[PDB]
Amino acid sequence: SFSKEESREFMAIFPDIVRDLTDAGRHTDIPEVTKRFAKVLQYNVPTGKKTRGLSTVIAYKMLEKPENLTPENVRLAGILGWCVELLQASLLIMDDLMDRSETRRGQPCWYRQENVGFLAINDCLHVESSLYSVLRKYFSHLPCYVPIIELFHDVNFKTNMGQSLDALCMKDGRPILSQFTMKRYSSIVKYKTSYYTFQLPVSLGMYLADMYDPEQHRQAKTILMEIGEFFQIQDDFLDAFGDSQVTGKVGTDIKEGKCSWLAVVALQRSNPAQRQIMEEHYGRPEPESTQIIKNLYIELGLPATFAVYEEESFNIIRTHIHQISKGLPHDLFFKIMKKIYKRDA
Amino acid sequence: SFSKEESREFMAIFPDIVRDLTDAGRHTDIPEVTKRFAKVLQYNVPTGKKTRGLSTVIAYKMLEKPENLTPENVRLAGILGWCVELLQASLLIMDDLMDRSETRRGQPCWYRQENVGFLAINDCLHVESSLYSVLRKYFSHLPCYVPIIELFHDVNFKTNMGQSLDALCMKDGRPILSQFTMKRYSSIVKYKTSYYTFQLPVSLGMYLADMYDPEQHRQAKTILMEIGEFFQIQDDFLDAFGDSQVTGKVGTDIKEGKCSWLAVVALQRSNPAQRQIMEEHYGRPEPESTQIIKNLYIELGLPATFAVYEEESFNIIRTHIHQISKGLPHDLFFKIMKKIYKRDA
Ligand SMILES: O=P(O)(O)C(O)(Cn1ccnc1)P(=O)(O)O
Ligand SMILES: O=P(O)(O)C(O)(Cn1ccnc1)P(=O)(O)O
Ligand SMILES: C=C(C)CCOP(=O)(O)OP(=O)(O)O
Ligand SMILES: C=C(C)CCOP(=O)(O)OP(=O)(O)O
Numbered sequence: 001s002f003s004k005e006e007s008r009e010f011m012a013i014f015p016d017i018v019r020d021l022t023d024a025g026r027h028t029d030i031p032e033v034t035k036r037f038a039k040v041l042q043y044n045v046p047t048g049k050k051t052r053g054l055s056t057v058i059a060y061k062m063l064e065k066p067e068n069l070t071p072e073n074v075r076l077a078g079i080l081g082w083c084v085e086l087l088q089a090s091l092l093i094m095d096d097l098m099d100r101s102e103t104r105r106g107q108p109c110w111y112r113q114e115n116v117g118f119l120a121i122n123d124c125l126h127v128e129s130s131l132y133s134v135l136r137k138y139f140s141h142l143p144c145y146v147p148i149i150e151l152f153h154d155v156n157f158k159t160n161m162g163q164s165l166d167a168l169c170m171k172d173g174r175p176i177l178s179q180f181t182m183k184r185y186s187s188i189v190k191y192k193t194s195y196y197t198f199q200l201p202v203s204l205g206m207y208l209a210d211m212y213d214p215e216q217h218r219q220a221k222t223i224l225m226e227i228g229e230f231f232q233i234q235d236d237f238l239d240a241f242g243d244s245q246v247t248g249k250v251g252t253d254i255k256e257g258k259c260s261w262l263a264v265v266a267l268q269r270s271n272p273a274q275r276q277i278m279e280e281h282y283g284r285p286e287p288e289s290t291q292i293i294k295n296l297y298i299e300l301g302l303p304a305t306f307a308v309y310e311e312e313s314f315n316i317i318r319t320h321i322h323q324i325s326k327g328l329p330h331d332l333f334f335k336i337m338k339k340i341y342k343r344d345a
Numbered sequence: 346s347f348s349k350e351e352s353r354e355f356m357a358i359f360p361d362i363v364r365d366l367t368d369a370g371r372h373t374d375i376p377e378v379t380k381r382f383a384k385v386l387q388y389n390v391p392t393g394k395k396t397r398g399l400s401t402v403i404a405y406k407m408l409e410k411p412e413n414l415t416p417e418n419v420r421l422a423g424i425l426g427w428c429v430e431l432l433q434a435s436l437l438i439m440d441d442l443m444d445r446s447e448t449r450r451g452q453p454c455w456y457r458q459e460n461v462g463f464l465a466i467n468d469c470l471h472v473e474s475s476l477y478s479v480l481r482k483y484f485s486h487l488p489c490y491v492p493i494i495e496l497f498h499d500v501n502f503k504t505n506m507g508q509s510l511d512a513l514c515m516k517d518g519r520p521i522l523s524q525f526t527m528k529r530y531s532s533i534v535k536y537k538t539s540y541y542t543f544q545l546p547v548s549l550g551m552y553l554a555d556m557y558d559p560e561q562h563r564q565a566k567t568i569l570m571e572i573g574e575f576f577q578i579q580d581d582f583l584d585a586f587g588d589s590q591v592t593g594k595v596g597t598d599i600k601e602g603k604c605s606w607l608a609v610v611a612l613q614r615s616n617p618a619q620r621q622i623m624e625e626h627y628g629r630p631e632p633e634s635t636q637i638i639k640n641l642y643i644e645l646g647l648p649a650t651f652a653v654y655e656e657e658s659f660n661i662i663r664t665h666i667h668q669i670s671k672g673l674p675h676d677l678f679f680k681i682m683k684k685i686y687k688r689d690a
């Protein structure tokens with residue numbers, strides 16, 4: 001699980017996905033566009049950690065009867081994982097535009113690159129639409145096809161709802177601090193991250209294994225929602241405190257006024273002088289105001305607060321995994337937690 | 346076809362679509378975003394002329410056997426038409442951002458509204474994803490379900506390719522005039538307009554009528570791509586020469602450096618002096634430059650050229666309809682052609 005050989009097998013599929021989308025004898029009257037789209041895919045799709053794609057394949061191998069794990073079915077799981085990566089890739093291109101970000105995966109964000117700009121918006125829709133072309137090619141004759149397309153449709157819709165709720169942090173260029181509660185936070189991360197990052201890979205593995213029991217999906221969802229919140233809290237910590245040479249990305253939550261876990265906990269922990277600092281300097285374009293907030297986060301001990309939370313939450317999520325039933329493999333959820341716990345990117 | 350009673354019938358379905366997407370007992374934990382999404386849908390979806398949605402219904406009524414046209418099946422054709430309007434709505438939200446436009450349908454472009462901006466990209470993705478939720482609710486029990494889903498995803502991909510070819514008119518802040526050929530133009534229009542505007546309504550009517558023969562779809566496509574080319578040429582003409590109070594939108598093609606029909610024909614007709622005016626002034630943000638280009642278009646006689654094209658093309662397409670397979674209803678194509686060209690005869 002998350003091994004050297006699994007990574008190889010997974011990356012080996014990527015050149016076939018590019019060929020399927022750009023060199024399959026289709027659209028031969030517009031080679032300018034298909035050759036460019038091959039570059040959009042090369043740049044934007046395969047340079048992340050690939051945890052979602054690799055989790056799709058691990059979930060399938062842990063759910064399917066061993067007797068059924070052929071080179072072809074394990075390749076189908078890897079193709080589904082790449083369709084999750086195409087969805088991720090599409091969401092990041094949009095997200096970086098919305099967040100006015102500088103870098104992604106160690107490079108300038110796509111929209112910033114020479115002669116891209118507002119062509120990144122279309123490129124995000126194009127990458128999203130491409131995953132359904134991949135699904136059609138490989139899954140259209142299998143019983144899992146309709147369930148899988150419906151799941152991608154539903155997760156997309158839910159992710160959009162979360163992205164909106166996330167964006168509604170600011171009104172008239174000031175953040176709505178009095179509404180930055182843990183209740184709000186948990187709602188945002190459920191929709192903007194947990195469905196597509198955790199629920200979607202495991203549900204896809206289930207469907208490819210012909211597991212359709214609604215209660216089995218519900219029990220997986222309950223735990224994966226808890227994992228997703230934990231994973232987004234880690235992301236938020238990285239925005240302010242991560243090493244951008246390691247994470248690949250420069251943080252923007254403070255400048256953008258976001259209802260991040262750090263903002264919520266800062267408001268919980270602040271004395272009245274510190275609350276006035278949030279009121280005056282949170283969600284401002286000026287570099288000096290963002291550093292004032294970072295310095296408040298340092299003085300509050302948010303790094304240590306996060307570290308204590310992460311350890312406590314890891315243990316609570318594992319306790320919950322142990323309570324799972326409906327015939328689900330505990331080690332699948334244990335492996336997912338081991339991969340992300342104490343991550344620095 | 347295209348009467349008030351038919352507009353009446355079609356518009357009555359819209360409030361149900363909004364309820365299906367925002368108030369069907371789902372996502373009850375995030376009313377802030379579902380209430381907001383009802384506003385997104387009200388502003389951006391039902392505010393156009395609804396030609397594509399109405400055309401879906403008319404195609405179904407002309408392709409289905411007369412004995413099969415129940416109120417229930419006609420209502421399903423109307424729901425399919427609203428799914429095309431959701432696709433249109435989504436495309437215009439993103440197009441307006443890419444084209445830096447001011448108005449759409451007589452109101453500010455969505456992105457220009459307070460507290461929208463690049464959140465319009467998320468609302469674009471959300472509106473397109475919605476249509477798959479509508480398809481699942483109403484069509485999932487019919488043979489046509491999968492062909493319809495696939496057509497929507499394939500048309501979206503093709504439209505994205507067309508939008509990218511459209512966008513590549515400029516490189517390094519100057520238009521690539523030497524590549525502005527009628528061959529390039531026709532490729533742009535096929536992909537960015539003709540598939541979703543003309544082919545999609547008719548192929549949807551075919552699928553709801555259980556017409557799956559790819560040859561029948563292909564016979565229709567030949568005519569519909571000719572109508573599409575006229576439709577986009579008219580749109581281009583009006584970008585420069587239309588009244589914005591009538592069109593509902595302020596033109597941006599000259600400033601944006603687009604390979605519009607006007608620019609393509611201007612380069613065809615220009616003497617060397619007139620070509621140097623295009624080289625110096627086309628695709629520039631300065632208002633003097635954009636007025637100099639409009640003056641060159643007047644000097645070249647482009648309004649009269651367009652008027653000749655509108656006459657010549659109408660008579661060519663009518664002649665081509667007469668030659669379609671006796672297997673398809675010629676009057677469907679005549680009705681579509683007459684609506685687009687605003688003719689009763
Ligand atoms: O913090 P965000 O939600 O914008 C982020 O996690 C992206 N994202 C978008 C939706 N869910 C996650 P990233 O930090 O990668 O920029
Ligand atoms: O001229 P465009 O292609 O941008 C346009 O026709 C929209 N559009 C987008 C794709 N096909 C058409 P509009 O003039 O409405 O802004
Ligand atoms: C949901 C979130 C936190 C977005 C980034 O996801 P990752 O941190 O998994 O990014 P990549 O590996 O895909 O780059
Ligand atoms: C493809 C084109 C020319 C975009 C606008 O289409 P319409 O002129 O049909 O727009 P609405 O009626 O939907 O506003």
Ligand SMILES: [Mn+2]
Nearest residue numbers: 095096099101
């Ligand atoms: Mn971001």
Ligand SMILES: [Mn+2]
Nearest residue numbers: 095098099166
């Ligand atoms: Mn974001």
Ligand SMILES: [Mn+2]
Nearest residue numbers: 235236239253
């Ligand atoms: Mn983040």
Ligand SMILES: [Mn+2]
Nearest residue numbers: 440441444446
């Ligand atoms: Mn436009």
Ligand SMILES: [Mn+2]
Nearest residue numbers: 440443444511
């Ligand atoms: Mn455009």
Ligand SMILES: [Mn+2]
Nearest residue numbers: 580581584598
């Ligand atoms: Mn136009």
